[PDB]
Enzyme design. Sequence first.
Site, PDB file in Angstrom:
ATOM      1  N   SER A 139       1.049  -0.817   0.156  1.00 47.15           N
ATOM      2  CA  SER A 139      -0.190  -0.430   0.034  1.00 47.15           C
ATOM      3  C   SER A 139       0.752   1.669   0.309  1.00 47.15           C
ATOM      4  O   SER A 139       0.869   1.931  -0.941  1.00 47.15           O
ATOM      5  CB  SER A 139      -1.429   0.022   0.879  1.00 47.15           C
ATOM      6  N   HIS A 155      -1.017   4.875   3.613  1.00 42.44           N
ATOM      7  CA  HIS A 155      -0.615   5.626   2.577  1.00 42.44           C
ATOM      8  C   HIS A 155      -0.382   7.043   2.753  1.00 42.44           C
ATOM      9  O   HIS A 155       0.130   7.684   1.353  1.00 42.44           O
ATOM     10  CB  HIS A 155      -2.624   6.528   2.366  1.00 42.44           C
TER      11      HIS A 155
END
Length: 176
Positions: A110, A157
């Site tokens: 991610s 993120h």
Amino acid sequence: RAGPVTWVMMIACVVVFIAMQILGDQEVMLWLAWPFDPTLKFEFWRYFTHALMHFSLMHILFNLLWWWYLGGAVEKRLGSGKLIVITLISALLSGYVQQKFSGPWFGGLSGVVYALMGYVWLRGERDPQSGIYLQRGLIIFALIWIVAGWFDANGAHIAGLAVGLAMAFVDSLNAR
């Protein structure tokens, strides 16, 4: 015709995932996860290997889709070296941040995928001639996706987008 790094990374993630299905997430996390005790402090690979673990099919399926296309683009136009640097630094700093939010038990590309998003976008915006660019549509899914995480957590993120934007901004200073 994606490059080597792009391929090796993809193979590496599928090999670990399969290992996880055969042995169990927890078991693979004992060897590949971010140091969970001072005694593992020097297992230097741990600060990067966490990015190789995924906990479902969609998880690894989605991450590998983005990686193949963004990493492929980067490797083709900027070279294997550039892809390696972005990956290593995004895996490290994104793991570092996630750790303080939820502890040492996390995994996945991610953070790495977001750095690529943030890199490929700012890079294409600042240095068009780089031969790389992120469709303004895709940059929307991304941000829509992050906000969706803050509700419906993975501070990876955010820390990932930051490293990518930073590196891009830095590789874009020599204007064209």
